[PDB]
Amino acid sequence: SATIALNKRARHEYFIEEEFEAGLALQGWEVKSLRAGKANISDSYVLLRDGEAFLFGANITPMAVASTHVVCDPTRTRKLLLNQRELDSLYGRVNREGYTVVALSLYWKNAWCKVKIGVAKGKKQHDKRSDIKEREWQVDKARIMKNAHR
RNA sequence: GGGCGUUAAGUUGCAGGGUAUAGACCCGAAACCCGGUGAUCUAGCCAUGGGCAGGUUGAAGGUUGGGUAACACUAACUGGAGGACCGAACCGACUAAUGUUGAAAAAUUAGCGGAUGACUUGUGGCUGGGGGUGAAAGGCCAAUCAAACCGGGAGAUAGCUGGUUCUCCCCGAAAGCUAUUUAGGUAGCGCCUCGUGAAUUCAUCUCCGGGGGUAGAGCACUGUUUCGGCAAGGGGGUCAACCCGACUUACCAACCCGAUGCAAACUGCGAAUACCGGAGAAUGUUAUCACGGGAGACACACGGCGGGUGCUAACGUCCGUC
RNA sequence: GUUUAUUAAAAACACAGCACUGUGCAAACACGAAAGUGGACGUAUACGGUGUGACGCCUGCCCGGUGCCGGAAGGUUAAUUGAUGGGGUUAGCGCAAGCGAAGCUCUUGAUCGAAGCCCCGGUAAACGGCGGCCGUAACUAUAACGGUCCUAAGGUAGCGA
RNA sequence: UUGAGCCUUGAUGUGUAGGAUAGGUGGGAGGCUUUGAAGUGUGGACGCCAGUCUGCAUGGAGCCGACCUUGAAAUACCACCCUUUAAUGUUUGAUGUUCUAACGUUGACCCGUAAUCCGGGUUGCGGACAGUGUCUGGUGGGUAGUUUGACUGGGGCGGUCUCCUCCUAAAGAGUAACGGAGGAGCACGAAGGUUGGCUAAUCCUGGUCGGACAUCAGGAGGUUAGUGCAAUGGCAUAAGCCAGCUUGACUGCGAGCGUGACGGCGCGAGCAGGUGCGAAAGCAGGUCAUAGUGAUCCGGUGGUUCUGAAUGGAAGGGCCAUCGCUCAACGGAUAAAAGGUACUCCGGGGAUAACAGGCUGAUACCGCCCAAGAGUUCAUAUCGACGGCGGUGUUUGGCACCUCGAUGUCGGCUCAUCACAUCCUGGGGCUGAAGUAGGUCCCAAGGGUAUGGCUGUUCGCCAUUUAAAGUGGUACGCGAGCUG
RNA sequence: AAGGCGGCCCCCUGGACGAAGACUGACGCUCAGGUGCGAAAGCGUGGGGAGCAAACAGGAUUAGAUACCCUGGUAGUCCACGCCGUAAACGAUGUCGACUUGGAGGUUGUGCCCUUGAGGCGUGGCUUCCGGAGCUAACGCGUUAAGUCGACCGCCUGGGGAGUACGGCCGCAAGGUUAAAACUCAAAUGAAUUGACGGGGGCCCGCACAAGCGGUGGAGCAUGUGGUUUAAUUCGAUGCAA
RNA sequence: CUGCAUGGCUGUCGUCAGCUCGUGUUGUGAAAUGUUGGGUUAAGUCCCGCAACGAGCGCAACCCUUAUCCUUUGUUGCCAG
RNA sequence: ACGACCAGGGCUACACACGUGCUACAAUGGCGCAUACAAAGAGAAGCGACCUCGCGAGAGCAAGCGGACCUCAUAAAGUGCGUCGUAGUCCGGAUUGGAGUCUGCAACUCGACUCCAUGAAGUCGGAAUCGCUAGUAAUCGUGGAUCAGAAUGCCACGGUG
RNA sequence: UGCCUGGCGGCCGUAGCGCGGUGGUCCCACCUGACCCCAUGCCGAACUCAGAAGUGAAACGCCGUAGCGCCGAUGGUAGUGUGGGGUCUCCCCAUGCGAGAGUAGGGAACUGCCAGGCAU
RNA sequence: GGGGCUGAUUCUGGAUUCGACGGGAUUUGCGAAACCCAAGGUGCAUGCCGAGGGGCGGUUGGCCUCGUAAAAAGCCGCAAAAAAUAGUCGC
Ligand SMILES: [Mg+2]
Ligand SMILES: [Mg+2]
Ligand SMILES: [Mg+2]
Ligand SMILES: [Mg+2]
Ligand SMILES: [Mg+2]
Ligand SMILES: [Mg+2]
Ligand SMILES: [Mg+2]
Ligand SMILES: [Mg+2]
Ligand SMILES: [Mg+2]
Ligand SMILES: [Mg+2]
Ligand SMILES: [Mg+2]
Ligand SMILES: [Mg+2]
Ligand SMILES: [Mg+2]
Ligand SMILES: [Mg+2]
Ligand SMILES: [Mg+2]
Ligand SMILES: [Mg+2]
Ligand SMILES: [Mg+2]
Ligand SMILES: [Mg+2]
Ligand SMILES: [Mg+2]
Ligand SMILES: [Mg+2]
Ligand SMILES: [Mg+2]
Ligand SMILES: [Mg+2]
Ligand SMILES: [Mg+2]
Ligand SMILES: [Mg+2]
Ligand SMILES: [Mg+2]
Ligand SMILES: [Mg+2]
Ligand SMILES: [Mg+2]
Ligand SMILES: [Mg+2]
Ligand SMILES: [Mg+2]
Ligand SMILES: [Mg+2]
Ligand SMILES: [Mg+2]
Ligand SMILES: [Mg+2]
Ligand SMILES: [Mg+2]
Ligand SMILES: [Mg+2]
Ligand SMILES: [Mg+2]
Ligand SMILES: [Mg+2]
Ligand SMILES: [Mg+2]
Ligand SMILES: [Mg+2]
Ligand SMILES: [Mg+2]
Ligand SMILES: [Mg+2]
Ligand SMILES: [Mg+2]
Ligand SMILES: [Mg+2]
Ligand SMILES: [Mg+2]
Ligand SMILES: [Mg+2]
Ligand SMILES: [Mg+2]
Ligand SMILES: [Mg+2]
Ligand SMILES: [Mg+2]
Ligand SMILES: [Mg+2]
Ligand SMILES: [Mg+2]
Ligand SMILES: [Mg+2]
Ligand SMILES: [Mg+2]
Ligand SMILES: [Mg+2]
Ligand SMILES: [Mg+2]
Ligand SMILES: [Mg+2]
Ligand SMILES: [Mg+2]
Ligand SMILES: [Mg+2]
Ligand SMILES: [Mg+2]
Ligand SMILES: [Mg+2]
Ligand SMILES: [Mg+2]
Ligand SMILES: [Mg+2]
Ligand SMILES: [Mg+2]
Ligand SMILES: [Mg+2]
Ligand SMILES: [Mg+2]
Ligand SMILES: [Mg+2]
């Protein structure tokens, strides 16, 4: 419905623990491009400086140059609007060993863009094997049980 | 009260100017329909008879020999089929030249293609026009074809070009407005001619009543616009070059005053010439108005003046005035 | 080979071959107001129509739209038939306005009523169409790749100033 | 297999109040007993299993009847029969099948008959089908009739077509362009009328959250506010604002005037009737004025002092009100209409375009004036910023001023002529001119001023030479000299 | 012969094995070049097409799935006549002759003995599993040898390049066949062993489950833990096993 | 400070039952047997078979208490008589 | 000076989440009055009987004992009575103001005991989850070490069963 | 006849602002209170009814004052009708009309009716 | 060279991105840095020249100290150079 460019690869590439429905803060010519304008949310992650967890990786194509005064930067760091009450998770459980929180998807909420955030961590190519093995094994167990019980 | 009318005579013939129907001042279309004629040219088809000199190439098939268990396959002899080959009659016209009131309303000379086949030709017949036929070009249908020829409706229509024939005298325009499947036409009005009736009816000059907002002028108003003061600040301060920043730095600078300008869509001002009315002599062949008969015209240009537009360029264009 | 007799003889038409479609005979189709004829004194290896045009490699995706074919579950639906509603008229009731039986007529139209249309599917060798946009690989370039906007599908093989 | 009339009602109910399945009302008090009732068992069904239409092997002799609740007396009576069913003949519609006599036979045999037409007789098959006439729905460029507007600095494309506001518009009115700038196809039962009362926008001071800004009290200001809306002209008596009552947002006229060719449109004192407000004189025929709008014909509604095809009526016609058009191409040609023609045709026009010729020169080319500077110093040996002044008609343009009763247009070959804003030769000045060799300027037209590849060349690129391979005018010279 | 052949019947026909015989007389084996047959898939023409099913569409899974799961579905798989001679066409083991311990079978024929029952002893062909000597690097072969020899043909000489290009032939095509060179590397491999691993299997055990019975997450409080604050919130312990 | 130089110590796997060696034998060899297989158990505990035969650390016992009974010594304890 | 000095704070704090346990949910349960049975332990800067007192903690005086002698130490659950009656309860005992006591020079940070007074939460608790196979689960009390005092923690002991 | 005040007109800046001062005999204005006649989108500030203790402050009316506002000459200038001319996007000549903006200067109104009171 | 449609999550004239990040940093108690001004203490403090300053140097010259003038001590720089990157990903 109101869904926009989403990053479903990061869901398989990470272990999503908790999610944040926090909003995004962006300048002109970009929110219009969210409707149509080729926004891409690849390589998305938070870049906490002090309390400024900007989303760094996103390429939103500028569709016009009619205002040829401001310099266009598709790789701009977008600000994020999150409650200070729930921002404690981000200044907390991020820098342990490898914890990250990445942008899973971006959609519309009554003419305002909301980017879904999620706390996760890497898999080192050995957790992926275990996940695939378990996903296949549950299916195989169900199939063999059904075949045996006819 | 208002409208229409009571007042105040028409009618029948003759001659003349219009109008309406008929052809309607005269010639001219391209086009439509109806009834007949054509296949002797040409297109196709049907039936019946002719024509294709001469010289090349050797497929199928058939024999002999080799070969195969039988085949298959190969060598030699014969073979004469090709919408075959070169090339004559015959058919056609791809190039060049001549010819263009020519020998000829498509031809001549030198070259050219097919020339045993989907060929060509003679004779007779059929296909008849919104139809015929078409190896398909809108090609042919008798030198005429995106609808053949002849006779009729039919003098079709033509807001379109041209022409309109003897004389004299008098008066004398317009090329503008409105509306228009309207712009090069038309109807009314604005103008022209004739007749009738009507009053200082009308015009020139003078005097007297009037309202402008144009030229010009100006910035009370709306915009525009330059400078100085009033004045807050900022901007790589000469200075510390780090500090309160010594604060003054050919930079923008609120509101208001003083000075200087611009304006078709600005007027606190504002003419001349224009326009209407009243009066007065003097002048004009009623020059004025109303009705009736007949028109014409509704393509204007130049020059002066005030302008839009264009480039205050155009013998350019759009308005008013003489 | 043929083609615009009389400015175009060609890449233009035709061609053998290929594909689709219609056609069970009193066949389709065409000329015919009709009879009748051709097709054809043929019989699905026959005939007509439409496209391409010997031969070799092939004819890849789409029914979204317009046609064609199969269906009548539902809605609408002609001609046709006519339940009544509303008036005209007068026998006649009313001292008068005015009610007003039957007959005949003016007008509305309950119900029946097929094809067709909407609809459900197929069919493209039927008419037809088959995308642009951003980032990303060791110097630079490009993008095998990844995301989202639409369509019914984004052009496969092959070829190319 | 199947509907209305019909074979008869087998007929279905329930006021918490209730032997409860209420007798249409009349007569309420029974035919009931051989006008053939309970007892006994219980397919279907009223099942809210109280009752019960109950149906029916055994019966073979009184259930009911008053009424208990009593808002309402029993369905025990008679039945003009409903709060609605029931089946077979039933009234003849559709579907299906059976049959033949209609009809068909481009099946066979015979006959007229010599004969593959035709007709008649026998017969097989199909069969009330097929097929034909009328009406009718759908499809139907296969065919026919047509339509596709106008202005336009040629035509097409674009834009516009009606109405209103300011300028142009030259001080009465009016006045055009594809000139310069904005709006309208409504709205109000109150935003109309009367009466009564009041008069801002804007800038300040102080004051709870309250601030460039809500509200409040005071202060400057005088229409720079407001008008239901675009602009213009006005409004202080207010035409702006608040409240009451109201419907004059009346009916029929209307002397007079203004604007229009006309159709028409607009203002209007005042008259008669009947109303609203205000004590009253007085004000009210809509809105502060200008856009808010469409003629005629045809038909829709109501009323009517009329006409009514012999009479009496009625359909019908007109009369007054009123309704249906983005006829927006808006003075509207039909209720009903798009394109191509290079296969084209006719009447016209240089009233009107493309080539040329003519007028001007925005553009084009060339010259000149001041001089930041470039140029080591030095403006001018050579260039020249920001501008201006010019000359030719030579590039691209403007006009439609001759030519559509005919002026052959690009380029190439032959043939030339003229001008100098001179390519070479000739003469000279200044040079950042040591010499050769260069730059610029001035005078000077006597002469000369290339060959091939590309492409239709003009133009242009390249290769090789020459002292040079100049720019232009002459219908962008020359087709009654030639090709195409 | 190989490829490969499965209801039944009819017709033609190839091949194989046995008791007892008769007969020609080395006529015997192999075989480059050549010839023929030859799984399926594929191609051409003419037919047919029930089911299945490349390509293709849709649905589902997945981060992605142009696939495995599902619904459709054309070529093809079915027939006749034609073309290729391609397979892990394998027994990864060429054709023919002789010899070499044994056991347990299947199929087929014949001889003999009293066949009272597939009673008993023999004797040939094919085929199956163990197994001695021997062989082999070992797996394994083992009278049907991979044991010892005899006759012949074909093939091999490091892994890639490469069974590739060119060249010749064949074929309508897809391609087949014959078959290199340049360049890189010091490796490429096979049989077996020990660990390890498997989304391989089997067995066993422990309050590991089941069975029971009580508890912890709900609520005061206690120390302990992580985070926060703070001057420090004193050090380490950080899954069972803090 | 460095338990990422260590000693010592401790927890878990786990009181789970395996971890090895000598000789011999087998295979050219890496290597295997023993340690595998049936019963049985808490167990590599016991037995049988098998080129295995034995041994070490090992799972048990030897160590500490309870459960019947004997003797000795009798205080601060017992009252059988 | 990262070596070293002592005094005052903080290791005991906090919007939070977590391991573990004690405490309760009330009729087998709390309120009180006879009444019963254990083992093993520690004791001289000590264990510390009596007695006088204190509603209570303990104050004063204080015997004996390196202990089969004395103390800590009338153990309870059990038992027989009464009583309450299903209620935020005579359940549940936390927070609160004040009072003293033990204790160590000093308990605002920061002890424990006491008893008068307010008398919280909580009323068998999701998903999950842990322990036990016999004198063990489960309940009741006692004892021991650390230490001036400051155990729901730790280690042991028996009763029921 | 003089002065003052109140009401209604002529005219709409020489007519009105600013500064200072004036007046309570009469008029004028503030002022007291409210059952009522009347009303507050509340509230006797506005309407109104019943009244003169106080007042001339506010507001009125008056006199001077040139900071204003305003009027406004003569002359000159621009423009313009007529007729004739130039070097013709614009001007000149003869004649007629002659602005606006300035300057000198003026400018603190004029006036009629009705009613009251002062002096007479 | 020209027109015509979109630059509008409403094409619906009234959106607290719910949240971080600037705002009078509007608001309620409050510490001399959210500040701050004649009286009890009675000591050698105010302008006085000062003194060059914490490990080192300097501060608007009176931000430290005094009592007969000085060590300077309350802040900055030399210094405290460790600030330099989500995850997966050669050994
Ligand atoms: Mg012919
Ligand atoms: Mg021969
Ligand atoms: Mg030939
Ligand atoms: Mg020939
Ligand atoms: Mg001949
Ligand atoms: Mg010839
Ligand atoms: Mg010839
Ligand atoms: Mg024709
Ligand atoms: Mg002809
Ligand atoms: Mg003729
Ligand atoms: Mg005729
Ligand atoms: Mg006629
Ligand atoms: Mg004629
Ligand atoms: Mg005509
Ligand atoms: Mg006509
Ligand atoms: Mg006329
Ligand atoms: Mg006169
Ligand atoms: Mg002017
Ligand atoms: Mg005209
Ligand atoms: Mg004319
Ligand atoms: Mg004109
Ligand atoms: Mg003209
Ligand atoms: Mg003129
Ligand atoms: Mg020709
Ligand atoms: Mg030809
Ligand atoms: Mg073709
Ligand atoms: Mg296709
Ligand atoms: Mg379709
Ligand atoms: Mg159909
Ligand atoms: Mg139908
Ligand atoms: Mg037509
Ligand atoms: Mg036109
Ligand atoms: Mg036009
Ligand atoms: Mg005018
Ligand atoms: Mg009023
Ligand atoms: Mg009126
Ligand atoms: Mg108005
Ligand atoms: Mg009509
Ligand atoms: Mg009549
Ligand atoms: Mg009548
Ligand atoms: Mg009537
Ligand atoms: Mg109408
Ligand atoms: Mg009009
Ligand atoms: Mg013509
Ligand atoms: Mg021209
Ligand atoms: Mg000419
Ligand atoms: Mg010029
Ligand atoms: Mg210089
Ligand atoms: Mg001529
Ligand atoms: Mg001519
Ligand atoms: Mg010269
Ligand atoms: Mg020279
Ligand atoms: Mg010179
Ligand atoms: Mg096959
Ligand atoms: Mg499938
Ligand atoms: Mg799929
Ligand atoms: Mg092989
Ligand atoms: Mg052989
Ligand atoms: Mg063997
Ligand atoms: Mg090959
Ligand atoms: Mg065992
Ligand atoms: Mg201690
Ligand atoms: Mg003057
Ligand atoms: Mg003057």
PDB file of C-alpha atoms (C1' of nucleotides) in Angstrom, chain G residues 82-138:
ATOM      1  C1'   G G  82     -11.472 -24.252  73.877  1.00  0.00           C
ATOM      2  C1'   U G  83     -12.057 -20.316  70.077  1.00  0.00           C
ATOM      3  C1'   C G  84     -12.688 -17.896  65.256  1.00  0.00           C
ATOM      4  C1'   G G  85     -16.207 -19.273  60.166  1.00  0.00           C
ATOM      5  C1'   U G  86     -14.566 -17.863  55.042  1.00  0.00           C
ATOM      6  C1'   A G  87     -14.038 -11.994  55.502  1.00  0.00           C
ATOM      7  C1'   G G  88      -7.900  -7.699  52.778  1.00  0.00           C
ATOM      8  C1'   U G  89      -9.813 -11.838  57.074  1.00  0.00           C
ATOM      9  C1'   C G  90      -8.056 -11.900  64.944  1.00  0.00           C
ATOM     10  C1'   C G  91      -4.774 -13.969  57.443  1.00  0.00           C
ATOM     11  C1'   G G  92      -0.811 -11.616  55.809  1.00  0.00           C
ATOM     12  C1'   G G  93       4.069  -7.946  59.279  1.00  0.00           C
ATOM     13  C1'   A G  94       6.018  -4.955  55.739  1.00  0.00           C
ATOM     14  C1'   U G  95       6.510   1.215  55.573  1.00  0.00           C
ATOM     15  C1'   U G  96       5.813   4.906  59.247  1.00  0.00           C
ATOM     16  C1'   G G  97       6.492   8.635  64.191  1.00  0.00           C
ATOM     17  C1'   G G  98       8.557   7.877  68.958  1.00  0.00           C
ATOM     18  C1'   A G  99      10.582   4.744  73.059  1.00  0.00           C
ATOM     19  C1'   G G 100      14.599   2.186  75.306  1.00  0.00           C
ATOM     20  C1'   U G 101      18.102  -2.437  75.179  1.00  0.00           C
ATOM     21  C1'   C G 102      22.577  -5.663  73.442  1.00  0.00           C
ATOM     22  C1'   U G 103      27.062  -4.164  71.305  1.00  0.00           C
ATOM     23  C1'   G G 104      31.706  -2.135  70.173  1.00  0.00           C
ATOM     24  C1'   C G 105      35.552   5.201  71.653  1.00  0.00           C
ATOM     25  C1'   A G 106      30.767   6.650  67.703  1.00  0.00           C
ATOM     26  C1'   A G 107      24.545   3.389  64.642  1.00  0.00           C
ATOM     27  C1'   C G 108      21.484  10.514  60.512  1.00  0.00           C
ATOM     28  C1'   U G 109      24.582   7.711  55.640  1.00  0.00           C
ATOM     29  C1'   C G 110      24.681   2.291  58.428  1.00  0.00           C
ATOM     30  C1'   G G 111      23.413  -2.755  62.788  1.00  0.00           C
ATOM     31  C1'   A G 112      20.225  -6.001  65.416  1.00  0.00           C
ATOM     32  C1'   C G 113      16.490  -6.822  69.611  1.00  0.00           C
ATOM     33  C1'   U G 114      12.157  -5.050  71.859  1.00  0.00           C
ATOM     34  C1'   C G 115       7.171  -3.893  72.673  1.00  0.00           C
ATOM     35  C1'   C G 116       2.726   0.376  72.360  1.00  0.00           C
ATOM     36  C1'   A G 117       0.793   2.534  67.987  1.00  0.00           C
ATOM     37  C1'   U G 118      -0.761   3.056  61.013  1.00  0.00           C
ATOM     38  C1'   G G 119      -1.330  -1.952  59.725  1.00  0.00           C
ATOM     39  C1'   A G 120       1.242  -1.874  52.729  1.00  0.00           C
ATOM     40  C1'   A G 121       1.418  -5.310  49.125  1.00  0.00           C
ATOM     41  C1'   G G 122      -0.531 -10.278  48.257  1.00  0.00           C
ATOM     42  C1'   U G 123      -5.794 -13.487  47.888  1.00  0.00           C
ATOM     43  C1'   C G 124      -1.725 -20.218  44.218  1.00  0.00           C
ATOM     44  C1'   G G 125       0.282 -16.017  39.782  1.00  0.00           C
ATOM     45  C1'   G G 126       1.156 -16.199  31.183  1.00  0.00           C
ATOM     46  C1'   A G 127       4.633 -18.128  28.054  1.00  0.00           C
ATOM     47  C1'   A G 128       8.163 -20.537  30.051  1.00  0.00           C
ATOM     48  C1'   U G 129      10.897 -23.282  34.165  1.00  0.00           C
ATOM     49  C1'   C G 130      13.652 -26.307  38.200  1.00  0.00           C
ATOM     50  C1'   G G 131      14.366 -30.039  41.790  1.00  0.00           C
ATOM     51  C1'   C G 132      13.743 -34.630  43.505  1.00  0.00           C
ATOM     52  C1'   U G 133      13.107 -42.765  42.800  1.00  0.00           C
ATOM     53  C1'   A G 134      12.837 -43.683  50.189  1.00  0.00           C
ATOM     54  C1'   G G 135      13.582 -42.604  55.503  1.00  0.00           C
ATOM     55  C1'   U G 136      14.318 -39.351  49.784  1.00  0.00           C
ATOM     56  C1'   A G 137      10.598 -35.280  48.153  1.00  0.00           C
ATOM     57  C1'   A G 138       7.789 -31.979  51.427  1.00  0.00           C
TER      58        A G 138
END
